Amino acid sequence: SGVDANVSISGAKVKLESLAALVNGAIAFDSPEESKPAEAEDTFGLYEDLAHSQRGVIIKLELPSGAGLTADSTPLMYQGLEVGQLTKLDLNPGGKVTGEMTVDPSVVTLLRENTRIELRNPKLSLSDANLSALLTGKTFELVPGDGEPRKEFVVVPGEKALLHEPDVLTLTA
Amino acid sequence: GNTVTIDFMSADGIVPGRTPVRYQGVEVGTVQDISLSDDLRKIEVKVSIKSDMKDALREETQFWLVTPKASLAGVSGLDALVGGNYIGMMPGKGKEQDHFVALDTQPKYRLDNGDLMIHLQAPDLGSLNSGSLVYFRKIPVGKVYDYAINPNKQGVVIDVLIERRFTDLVKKGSRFWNVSGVDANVSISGAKVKLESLAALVNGAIAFDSPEESKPAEAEDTFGLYEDLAHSQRGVIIKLELPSGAGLTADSTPLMYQGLEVGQLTKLDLNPGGKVTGEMTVDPSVVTLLRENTRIELRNPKLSLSDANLSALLTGKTFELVPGDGEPRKEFVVVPGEKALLHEPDVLTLTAGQPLQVGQVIDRKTFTVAIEPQHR
Known part of the structure; x- marks a missing residue:
């Protein structure tokens, strides 16, 4: 209507x-x-x-901060394609930000333990000046893992993506 | 004159005197009476019929009440406004029946x-x-x-x-x-x-x-x-295995050849295992060029120093056709624009996109490089 x-x-x-x-x-x-x-x-x-x-599965997300995030415009990327869409974006008491997202069933099998989700940022590519990426703003990313299925996730900043990995050599910007 | 009892859920603007029964407008008779039984909306209408139509009066004979319809979706009051609320019928090839139920509306x-x-x-x-x-x-x-x-x-x-x-x-x-x-x-x-x-x-x-x-x-x-x-559009279908549909769109990404649009991506889907596959339509005029060793590469809108081409930037990613020779084929693997030189019939491969121009670097790790066949 x-x-x-x-x-x-x-x-x-x-x-x-x-x-x-x-x-x-x-x-x-x-x-x-x-x-x-x-x-x-x-x-x-x-x-x-x-x-x-839409009939998709729900996922709870604990976020750092929803600076550029939008409740029904922020998508989920995988292999260059939209698979999911953020649905809810709320502020919890104590300053914590939490959201919930819908995902197509076709990818839900990939949602397992040690499956990390990272907020990517539209990069200023020197070679391929991608206007649509700049216009879209922030975007998430899927990177499958292996393990038991899970439905609660903690989003990692794109900078710290290398840190939150199953295998990584951490030493002591 | 005859008698037929028809059951109506409702009988709005009907009078026993003048409710002429029509069959494509020809009067078959008139209603004799309107009444009800045990107050249960079984509005029994007794109808007189000319004996000529009496023979065809059978079980499958359908009836309905026409009505003026000035609603949002309706103009079918052309005759009911002038001739009043009549009723329409359709003969059937049943056996016989005398007690009937009026159809809610006029059937097709x-x-x-x-x-x-x-x-x-x-x-x-x-x-x-x-x-x-x-x-x-x-x-x-x-x-x-x-x-x-x-x-x-x-x-x-x-x-x-x-x-x-x-x-x-x-x-x-x-x-x-x-x-x-x-x-x-x-x-x-x-x-x-x-x-x-x-x-x-x-x-x-x-x-x-x-x-x-x-x-x-x-x-x-x-x-x-x-x-x-x-x-x-009548075009030929082509299956494509893709690296990733980052900028690709299912019905906006075109196929280029000699600067002109010839084809249009149609379907873009994710297969299990992370593989991405699409399918494309092509004009027949170019299909003869689709052969073996015909490669298709995703180009990218380049930031030209000389001719600042705005439309290219706005369009985003675009494919490219580069004909080959051999048997016709319909399945293709799309190559990145960087690796276009690599997937060639003739190319000098040696062991990141830097030039050599007489060649280009393919990858690092060890350096893998390529030289053109003409400079070979």
Whole structure:
């Protein structure tokens, strides 16, 4: 329901909904193949948008600071592709910042112990001046590990990525 | 005169006196009475019928109440406003029945004449309301008849009508694509916004193209709907194994050759194990060049000192075609632009992108380098 603009970098297009959907509002719904049929005034939850209705797994993140992070625009990268999307970004008492993220199921098997997640930063490449990276701002990164599945993670700064590794030679900017 | 009892959930603007029963408008009779039984919304309407139609009156004979419809989606009050609320019927080839249930609305009817009926498969309906229009070169040649859901919940089956005088236009190879809704078409260094016609937006529409050589389709032959004219393009498909789709986009990344766009990446997916694979469409005019030892490399928008090319920077990454010679092939492995010199039919490989220019460094660790075949 309602209509907005969808502005994208280096070109844009604006198509959201049908005329009746805007004059009157509307709902849409999807049905999993395997579930059982609901009945008898069974309650359900409405999601404000198709994006928020996406069926992905939830991950809790303890963050250093959400300086450039945005609650529904910051993506998760892997092999150059978006797989996940930050969903919630909140301040806890004591100054700690915590968020929660959605991930596509196709990658969830990679989420295991010694799987680290690092905030990358858009770098000023001398060779390939990548404008889109600069415009996007901060972005996370996935780097799979091996071990038991886990769902709570601590995000590491991109600088300290080498430090938080299974194997690394630490000596005593 | 006859008697027929019809069950109505509701009977809004009906009077026993003048509610003439019509069959495509010809009066079949009039309602005799309207009443109810045990106050349970079983509105029994007794109807008189001319004996000529009495024979065809059978089990499958359907009935419904027409009504003026000035709602948001409805204009079907053309006759009910003038002639009053009549009721419509359709004869059936049942056995016989006298007690009936009125259908809630007017059902869809099939003209007996020689037209064409065909089926479109679509994962979603789009903005195609019943009555949306079918075009050949923006000439209407038929309309949407009905839509429904296949037994599996993973698709939609539309069935559509084509007039007699155009039944030759529909071929087996003919492609259908949706034309509906309106967007903005923003381009760099200037933009223009023209998509579709007013009716195409109010109602939605389909367009279709017919290859010259194919055979005419017939008899409810299924077809595939393409969401847009672009996705309906007739080009050859190529599978690509990629290093990483950092800047790649599924329907914006083009293929270059001699400075011109020839192809367009279509699909971009992550395979298990971290491998990335995509698929691309190419114009037929270049497909003959796709052979063995034909390499495809991802180029990058370079910061040219001389010709500061803004459009290249804005576009981001782009592929490149460099023809080879050999057997035709359809699977390719994309090479990084840095390693383009390495993956060549002839190259002098010795044991990080520094020049030598007569050659370039390939990698460090030990130094691996390459020299061009002409300078070999």
